[PDB]
Design a protein around this ligand. Structure first.
Ligand SMILES: [Zn+2]
Ligand SMILES: [Zn+2]
Ligand SMILES: [Zn+2]
Ligand SMILES: [Zn+2]
Ligand SMILES: [Zn+2]
Lengths: 263, 15, 282, 44, 421, 105
């Protein structure tokens, strides 16, 4: 069994700027490309299953939980429910100038517990392979680092691949998330052809990914910096309590001020 | 030690 | 991740270090798979086991928590000297000792654990054994006698050949070592490494990547327990917020801060695996 | 932010377009050729 | 003619039929989901490509490992003529219908909405009565079309004009097959006999795919109801409900698991004794084909597997493999604990009894003797070998035997060789 | 006496199947043969009882076979078992009752 979760960075600031920029690629066509991927993923195998989540600066919403047009109800209903659910998010959304960073950690969290719920509801007669495809486009936030790291290790622990399909802004932690989880990361230069990357690079699952040739992952710069200056450094002094990278020795660590002794 | 021989471990009939 | 583990096998009055302290679980696990065929003959020696460990752990730094986990099987154990002196030495050496007894409630193990501050437990059943080892995975809570210290640490960056064996730097791994196309370095060793985190083979300094540290920060950010609401309590959210599934049973929990609603499976998975409240991230 | 929020709301007026209007062989081939071993996106 | 899988039928398709068979409603979905795990990716990739690409690209896109599987899958899709090299451009009808299949592009009064269990039970019931007619039951459901169908399917033959049809060698082998495999062979033969009898396979087969998710179709659909594969409360209803069996269709035992998801009932003892906790006489009839039945109880039957009953079964055409399979697939939960599930002594004895039945291998042939030289003998032998006409040889004894058909070729060659004089 | 179209002797006209036949591990044939589910939860009691009242015929791993005989019945009476006692317990063990031909026997 294969479970594919698609995460769309539906941030209205970036996509709105692109609309104001008269960008060729747009969120609608992006959601439509996601729709084709979701359909084609399920279309690939009877046991294939999927979920879709979109994120907004305020919150994230799930897009997925007769034959009047002569076609299968599941595909047709999946298309309609996804369109209706995305429109509800876009229409039912507040406006706030102070908050613009896109939510990602909360979206991945819901996906992981959803996958875990599915991992329990699935019959033990069959094994379920799960993957998360993150479609990032707008800027990340430093506050998300801690929470994003939590979900990254949970996904690794629970063997979920994080596949990153970046549109514009390249999050250093996102390119780390895939590498830590063994997922792929790519930034598309030709946003209008995003669907080709999805079907060629992101469509194949781990079993297919192994038996196939794909561009090697981009080198990941695992930067490290002291919490006092946030400057990249090769040597940092941590403590067995705060475990925080300090710039230099101090009798008291500013985050805790515990009574360290000179040495 | 004292394991069973092959003729007692598996089917000797060609099938 | 920054921790290291070692293993000792004790039989026929002797104690042998199966594998010294290292950061490679695969090496230890490889030795365990081999040890499945061990002779399993003779009597063990707690005194020799502890002393061999102490002769190793005594040279360890002060900031690192020195510890020993004893899987005691045969309640009889030969010893060349009074274990009480060794116990007093363990307290002085600040080596945390905790014993796990299988089908036995031994006196020496009782005093050894409780005097040293560690704990002595006995296997009730397979689930108890699984639970006890799972519990031991937790970092030890700091005793009022325990003191904190800083440690110098190295955060190198993995480096690779520019393009398909071009501008490469031919070298073998420090871990019949094969050639290294790419790998981490050390500012002082200048020796290339294939696997991190690891202690310097030269400088005696720990090399580690920043995510490995964050992997421990859940210990620093313990998740607050969500209040239980097993009854429906007229909660209009038929679907569980975490899994968007209708709650099939009279077991439900709500967050203390974000007030979101999660089922027992979500709450367990959150507290056991995610270690964060999905709604609190917002 | 307000302009982007309003502009995107009007951008959401069209949905479920034609796959053959959404994508083209020229765009698709450009991606495949870029991902080919000699292309811009295939490092080797 | 043991057509154990769809692939054999897929090869039995010409471009003049494939193009029509490649319809948008179901064939594209059915074919695509049946393609190998590799080719499905490339077909989906090129769904937006109007220009062909070289085979080297497909080859280099796969590792040296699994290249054989890629080649094999390439052989299938090229054999299916899904694309052309033109140097792998998809067929326009296939690409267009696959594209439409992703999105699609009809209603009326409510139906009786009969329960899915009821549908599958009478479907199983319908298949059972078909098998009750197939077996030597003294009374069973009959129909002129059903009878001739089973006969043209090579499962039954009428020994005398007016006497009830009897079972053929293939029919006995067929009877022991599992329901999905057994149904598959029937579906395949119906399809082949349909085109033979003038029913347009294109429409009915495409309809079978649709059921897995015209007057010709109505006639065909009537047979499907008689097969219990579809429910229709009354012949007047323009709408029907596909049964589980029809939904499964060509999915095979790989889809939704094998028919083994049923209560086991056969117990096999080391003394060749059988105890089958059953009331369904069909199972009894099948068991009687190879075992001597001793006692019958309200819920169980006692039988013994003897040389007589087994060698009789083998003589009729059955194989120990089918017998062992029939038992293993029906083995009672209690004997599932032991491994192997069947007692090795039993399995070995049954195999050994069939292997005894064919101790002598009989082969038609023509033997030449008294070869005047080893050279011309080996020369003629090399020609027989080159023709693949050789049956057996002993050059040390200077002898060889060849197939009667091939003999005419060596007879001609021998005369030609002799006429060189 | 009664035989189906197949060589097996049938006893539908001879004995019924009890409501909890699944719990009862034994069958009684009108010809005196007896079968016992060796894997049944009460097998222990049934084995002892059948060794007491009947003659073992086959004792394979899953289903044992016994037959009644005058000698085996005398042995049952030799341990003080009354006709009612063996009948009552046999009926209780039998998932298909006791055939009257055997009862009068
Ligand atoms: Zn500190
Ligand atoms: Zn500083
Ligand atoms: Zn160093
Ligand atoms: Zn939940
Ligand atoms: Zn909470």
């Amino acid at each position: 069994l294969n479970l594919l979760v698609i995460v769309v960075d539906a941030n209205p600031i970036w996509w709105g700027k692109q609309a104001l920029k008269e960008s060729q690629f747009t969120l609608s066509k992006c959601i439509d490309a996601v729709m084709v991927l979701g359909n084609s993923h399920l279309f690939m195998n009877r046991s294939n299953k999927l979920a879709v989540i979109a994120s907004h600066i305020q919150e994230s919403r799930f897009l997925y939980p007769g034959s009047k047009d002569g076609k299968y109800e599941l595909l047709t209903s999946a298309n309609e429910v996804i369109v209706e659910e995305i429109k509800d998010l876009m229409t039912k959304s507040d406006i706030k100038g102070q908050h613009t960073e896109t939510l990602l950690a909360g979206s991945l969290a819901k996906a992981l517990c959803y996958i875990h719920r599915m991992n329990k509801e699935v019959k033990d007669n069959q094994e379920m392979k799960s993957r998360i495809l993150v479609i990032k486009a707008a800027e990340d936030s430093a506050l998300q680092y801690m929470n994003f790291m939590n979900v990254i290790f949970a996904a690794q622990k629970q063997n979920i691949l994080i596949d990153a399909c970046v549109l514009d802004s390249d999050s250093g932690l996102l390119q780390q998330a895939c590498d830590i989880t063994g997922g792929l990361y790519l930034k598309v230069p030709q946003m209008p052809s995003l669907l080709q990357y999805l079907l060629w690079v992101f469509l194949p699952d781990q079993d297919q990914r192994s038996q196939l040739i794909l561009p090697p992952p981009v080198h990941v710069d695992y930067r490290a910096a002291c919490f006092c200056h946030r400057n990249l450094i090769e040597i940092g002094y941590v403590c067995s309590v705060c475990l925080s990278i300090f710039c230099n020795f101090s009798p008291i660590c500013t985050t805790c001020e515990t009574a360290f002794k000179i040495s | 030690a004292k394991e069973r021989p092959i003729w007692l471990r598996e089917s000797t009939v060609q099938g | 991740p920054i921790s290291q583990i070692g293993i000792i096998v004790t039989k026929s009055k002797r104690a042998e270090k199966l594998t010294e302290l290292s950061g490679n679980p695969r090496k230890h696990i490889t030795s365990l798979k081999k040890a499945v065929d061990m002779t399993c003959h003779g009597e063990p020696s707690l005194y020799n086991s502890l002393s061999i460990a102490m002769q190793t752990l005594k040279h360890m730094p002060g900031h690192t928590s020195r510890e020993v986990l004893i899987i005691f099987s045969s309640l009889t154990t030969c010893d060349p000297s009074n274990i009480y002196d060794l116990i007093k030495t363990l307290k002085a050496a600040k080596i945390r000792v905790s014993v796990i007894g299988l089908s036995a409630e031994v006196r020496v193990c009782t005093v050894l654990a409780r005097e040293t501050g560690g704990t002595y437990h006995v296997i009730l059943d397979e689930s108890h054994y699984k639970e006890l080892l799972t519990h031991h995975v937790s970092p030890p809570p700091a005793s009022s006698s325990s003191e904190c210290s800083l440690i110098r640490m190295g955060f190198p960056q993995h480096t690779i050949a520019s393009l398909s064996d071009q501008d490469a730097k031919p070298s073998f791994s420090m871990a019949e070592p094969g050639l290294t196309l790419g790998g981490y370095f050390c500012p002082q060793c200048r020796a290339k490494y294939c696997e991190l985190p690891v202690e310097c083979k030269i400088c005696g300094l720990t090399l580690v990547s920043a995510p490995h540290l964050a992997r421990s920060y859940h210990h620093l950010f313990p998740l607050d327990a969500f209040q239980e609401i097993p009854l429906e309590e007229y909660n209009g959210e038929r679907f569980c917020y975490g899994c968007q599934g209708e709650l099939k049973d009279q077991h439900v929990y709500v967050c203390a801060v974000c007030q979101n609603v999660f089922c027992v499976d979500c709450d367990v998975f959150v507290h056991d695996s995610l270690h964060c409240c999905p709604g609190c991230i917002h | 932010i307000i302009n982007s929020f309003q502009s995107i709301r009007q951008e959401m007026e069209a949905y479920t377009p034609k796959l053959t209007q959404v994508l083209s062989s020229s765009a698709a081939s450009s991606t495949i050729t870029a991902l080919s071993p000699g292309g811009a996106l295939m490092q080797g | 003619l043991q057509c154990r899988n769809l692939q054999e039928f897929l090869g039995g398709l010409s471009p003049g039929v494939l193009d029509r068979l490649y319809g948008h409603p179901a064939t594209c979905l059915a074919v695509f989901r049946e393609l190998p795990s590799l080719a499905k990716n490339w077909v989906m990739r090129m769904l937006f490509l109007e220009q062909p690409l070289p085979q080297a690209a497909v080859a280099l896109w796969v590792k040296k490992e699994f290249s054989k599987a890629q080649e094999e899958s390439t052989g299938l899709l090229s054999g299916l003529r899904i694309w052309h090299t033109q140097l792998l451009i998809l067929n326009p009808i296939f690409r267009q219908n696959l594209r439409i299949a992703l999105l699609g592009g009809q209603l009326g009064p409510d139906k009786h909405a009969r329960d899915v269990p009821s549908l599958d039970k009478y479907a199983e019931e319908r298949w059972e009565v078909v098998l009750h007619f197939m077996v030597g039951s003294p009374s069973a459901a009959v129909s002129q079309d059903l009878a001739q169908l089973l006969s043209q399917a090579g499962l039954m033959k009428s020994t005398e004009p007016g006497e009830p049809p009897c079972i053929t060698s293939a029919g006995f082998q067929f009877l022991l097959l599992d329901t999905p495999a057994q149904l598959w062979y029937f579906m395949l033969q119906y399809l082949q006999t349909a085109q033979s009898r003038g029913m347009d396979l294109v429409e009915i087969l495409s309809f079978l795919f649709q059921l897995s998710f015209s007057d010709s179709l109505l006639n065909f659909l009537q047979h499907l109801r008689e097969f219990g594969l579809v429910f229709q409360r009354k012949r007047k209803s323009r709408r029907y409900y596909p049964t589980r069996l029809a939904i499964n269709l060509s999915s095979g035992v790989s889809g939704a698991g094998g028919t083994v998801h049923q209560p086991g009932f056969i117990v096999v003892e080391t003394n060749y004794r059988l105890y089958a906790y059953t009331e369904s006489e069909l199972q009894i009839a099948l068991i009687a084909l190879f075992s001597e039945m001793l006692y019958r109880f309200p819920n169980m039957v006692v039988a013994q597997v003897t040389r007589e009953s087994v060698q009789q079964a083998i003589a009729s055409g059955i194989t120990a493999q089918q017998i062992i399979h029939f038992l293993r697939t029906r083995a009672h939960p209690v004997m599932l604990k032991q491994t192997p599930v069947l007692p090795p002594t039993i399995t070995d004895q049954i195999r050994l009894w069939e292997l005894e039945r064919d101790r002598l291998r009989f082969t038609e042939g023509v033997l030449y003797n008294q070869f005047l030289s080893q050279v011309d003998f080996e020369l003629l032998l090399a020609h027989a070998r080159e023709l693949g006409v050789l049956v057996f040889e002993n050059s040390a004894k200077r002898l060889m035997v060849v197939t009667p058909a091939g003999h005419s070729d060596v007879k001609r060659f021998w005369k030609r060789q002799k006429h060189s004089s | 006496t009664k035989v189906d179209e197949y060589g097996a002797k049938d006893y539908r006209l001879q004995m019924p199947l009890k409501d909890d036949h699944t719990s009862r591990p034994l069958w009684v044939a009108p010809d005196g043969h007896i079968f016992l589910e060796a894997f049944s939860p009460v097998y222990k009691y049934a084995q002892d009882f059948l060794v007491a009242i009947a003659e073992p015929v086959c004792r394979p791993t899953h289903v044992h076979e016994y037959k009644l005989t005058a000698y085996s019945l005398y042995a049952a009476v030799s341990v003080g078992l009354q006709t009612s006692d063996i009948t009552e317990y046999l009926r209780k063990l039998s998932k298909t009752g006791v055939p009257d031909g055997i009862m009068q026997f």
